Design a protein around this ligand. Structure first.
Ligand SMILES: Nc1ncnc2c1ncn2[C@@H]1O[C@H](CSCC[C@H](N)C(=O)O)[C@@H](O)[C@H]1O
Lengths: 265, 265
């Protein structure tokens, strides 16, 4: 009689919470989407094995246009689960699906899972110091998205770090790298010339958070822009003014140049 | 030779991820800290029973002053687990513990878990619009801290939401309520009179996130300040201008008054 939004986590099938697993195991039917993010350390097969259920994967069109036609109808007579990577309601539009559920007379419940949005804490940057977040979208045709640039500018002026979700085209199997995001930002810099992102700008890259050996690197764009950070997914962070302990972590754990230890107060 | 930082999640013993539980089980010794926060929906007894290991609780001083004397020594000839509520490294002091592990020649790995920082997405508010975060601390003696007030101002000034962690006396198990938090904020507004928090300010309250029955309420201070939001923990959010989709969710899912569709959008 109910619908469950259950997050699967950051990297592999085991990043689901015990709560999430126990509930999914007792659902009559399980649905899922794998276009909002990329779980690089697992396969649908492994998720199905762990949950002991067959999972019907939905596309963005299935969800965005027919969620109330494919999923909700079954709720009235079943306990249904809808699985998604990371946390189901973070940097997605899935929250709106709950409204669709309500209007359809279906109760819904949300089971959280580790999200890239808080996992950035592994970079050593104070979570509270993060300001507005943004997404670096692939330019398409004559349309070249550039709003994320201004977001970085506003946060920096306030001494806040900027979290940059990188773009994804799940059906084309394209996952934007930190390198590609940097290239786009350098280009937007030439455009606006606001001195927001250049060769000397310090950045932090977090790749495959959730795995046991994520790639955590910090340095100047000029040096990291052509560095190999491994397989996707990637996230890119542009730090604001650094606290001393933040810098120490970047140097000790993320291999940043020792010179950032010298914070300019 | 290894140390694992494992998040316990949001509310109860099932909020740990399958990865964290399976790893905690293969660990020779397991420590835990409950001073950055508490797991309001469970007990040490239940967590121990789920993991099947005796758990040694460490106080703030144990960790901040003797982490390398209590935890790291065992981490040399054993696999050690250090459990924390939420997602590891979200608490600002945790990050350096990894530097200590390095200094001691001990490998460390982080096992993520749901954090309130990402769980607020269940309020229906877009995660990207959250700005800097703050903690509302209890005034004591001749000390009246109000930086959290300024944080709201700067965020809402740029149309961003403000996540407010409420004070907590971990050791004494005392939780600051949203009600008290609103009272404090009304007192500060009467102090700085910068028009940031009044009876007409729209706020959002999230209680017991992670539970299947969290309390999600939205409304104007005058109507919520004396409302009973249930048992702790409470989280207070002061939203900035709302996207129609955010407002509709607050009305449909959190019982917000229709007035917000015209006043806060
Ligand atoms: N494990 C991971 N490591 C690095 N970046 C990740 C990641 N998981 C997601 N992302 C980043 O976030 C984007 C997906 S946005 C959706 C996020 C998801 N709900 C969550 O809670 O994590 C990706 O394109 C990528 O840039």
């Amino acid at each position: 009689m109910v619908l469950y939004f259950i997050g699967l986590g950051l990297y592999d099938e085991r990043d689901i919470t015990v709560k999430g697993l126990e509930i999914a195991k007792k659902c009559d039917m399980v649905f899922a989407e794998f276009y909002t993010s990329l779980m690089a350390g697992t396969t649908l097969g492994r998720i199905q094995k762990l949950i002991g259920k067959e999972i019907r994967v939905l596309s963005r069109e299935d969800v965005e246009l027919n969620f109330e036609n494919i999923v909700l109808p079954l709720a009235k007579e079943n306990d249904v689960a809808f699985l998604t990577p990371g946390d189901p309601l973070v940097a997605t539009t899935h929250a709106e699906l709950r409204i669709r559920a309500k209007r359809a007379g279906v109760e819904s419940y949300v089971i959280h899972a580790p999200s890239i949005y808080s996992a950035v804490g592994i970079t050593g940057l104070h979570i509270y110091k993060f300001g507005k977040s943004a997404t670096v979208a692939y330019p398409e045709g004559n349309w070249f998205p550039t709003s994320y640039y201004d977001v970085i500018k506003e946060n920096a002026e306030r001494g806040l770090h900027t979290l940059l979700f990188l773009d994804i085209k799940a059906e084309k199997r394209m996952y934007m790298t930190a390198n590609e995001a940097m290239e786009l930002l350098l280009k937007v810099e030439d455009m606006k010339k606001g001195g927001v992102f250049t060769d000397d700008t310090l950045v932090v890259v977090l790749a495959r958070a959730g795995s046991l050996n994520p790639t955590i690197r910090a340095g100047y764009v000029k040096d990291l822009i052509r560095e190999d950070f491994g397989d996707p997914p990637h996230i890119l962070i542009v730090p604001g003014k650094l606290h001393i302990v933040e810098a120490e972590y970047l140097v000790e754990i993320a291999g940043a140049p020792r010179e950032i230890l010298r914070v300019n107060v």
